[PDB]
Write a protein that binds this ligand. Structure first.
Ligand SMILES: CNC(=O)c1cnc(N)c(O[C@H]2CN(C(=O)Cc3ccc(OC(F)(F)F)cc3)CC2(F)F)c1
Ligand SMILES: O=c1[nH]cnc2scc(-c3ccccc3)c12
Length: 279
């Protein structure tokens, strides 16, 4: 609702974390932001376009970001609209995006079953919060989740460049989409549940691409024909049953995210005795 304004001179740019067609993402130090922290690390999203239409969409986005307040949603600290580029200030998530984190802590040391369940439960918690507000993400994927201090996982959205392999042309993240979104461009709480099922599969494959053996066109055929991603080796049968509940063809037959979260949280507190090496 009421967007916080940060003075330009309170932001000290330290490094470039990434860039897209929108502009750049920087690592920065922000002064006079949090109490007892005279200097603190932040991630700064800088918009290249300064047009009156870009400014209005930026204001809309900033207001929405101000409203979202949750333990597993990336924190937004405010804006800097002191001329071009328009800046958005977020907490800095020191371990980067979940997709890269899963691949860097994969068998290629490796995250254990308990750690994989805690990651999945935390992504589910953030989605319970979004579903409660009737907020539809539309791009739920591990590339849009972030890992901070102490394996804390939060949902975000990079809006960047390194993941254009994940979108097919308007750019659509087709491998994470249910049949009703591919065919009709219909995005709901139910399509977010399907994308969560795919997020679960990415977690338990340590960040592999869904349908990696196939081109975008072939993956659309698999999805729209009712083909299902196979059970990952690190995935216990109890977690795969949760993924399958997310992937019902009909949106009305998929489980609610609150129920998916409650099942995952119960397994994260008491992990099933499952050894990936024994299958
Ligand atoms: C190497 N480390 C990095 O790259 C890195 C580290 N820490 C970051 N904070 C970061 O920021 C990038 C990711 N961002 C968002 O996730 C923003 C966001 C968007 C929607 C939302 O609400 C939700 F409900 F939709 F999820 C909540 C937050 C902004 C960004 F681009 F700056 C990058
Ligand atoms: O981000 C980088 N990558 C590779 N070389 C360099 S030299 C300087 C930077 C930098 C420093 C501050 C803000 C933005 C960028 C940089």
């Amino acid at each position: 609702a009421c967007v916080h304004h940060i003075k330009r001179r309170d932001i000290v740019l330290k490094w470039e974390l990434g860039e897209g067609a929108f502009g750049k993402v920087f690592l920065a130090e922000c002064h006079n932001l949090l109490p007892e922290q005279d200097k603190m690390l932040v991630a700064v999203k800088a918009l290249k376009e300064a047009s009156e239409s870009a400014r209005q969409d930026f204001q809309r986005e900033a207001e929405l970001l101000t409203m979202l307040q949750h333990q597993h949603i990336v924190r937004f600290f405010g804006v800097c609209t002191e001329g071009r580029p328009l800046l958005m200030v977020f907490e800095y998530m020191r371990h980067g995006d979940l997709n890269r984190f899963l691949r860097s802590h994969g068998p290629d040391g490796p995250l254990g079953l308990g750690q994989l369940l805690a990651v999945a439960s935390q992504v589910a918690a953030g989605m319970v919060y979004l579903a409660g507000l009737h907020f539809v993400h539309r791009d739920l994927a591990t590339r849009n989740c972030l890992v901070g201090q102490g394996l804390v996982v939060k949902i975000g959205d990079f809006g960047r460049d390194i993941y254009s392999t994940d979108y097919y042309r308007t750019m659509l993240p087709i491998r994470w989409m249910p049949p009703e979104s591919i065919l009709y461009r219909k995005f709901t709480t139910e399509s977010d549940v399907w994308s969560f099922g795919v997020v679960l599969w990415e977690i338990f494959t340590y960040g592999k691409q869904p349908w990696y053996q196939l081109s975008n066109t072939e993956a659309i055929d698999c999805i729209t024909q009712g083909r299902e991603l196979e059970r990952p080796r690190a995935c216990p049968p109890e977690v795969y049953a949760i993924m399958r509940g997310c992937w019902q063809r009909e949106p009305q037959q998929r489980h609610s995210i609150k129920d998916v979260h409650a099942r995952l949280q119960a397994l994260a507190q008491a992990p099933p005795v499952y050894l990936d090496v024994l299958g």
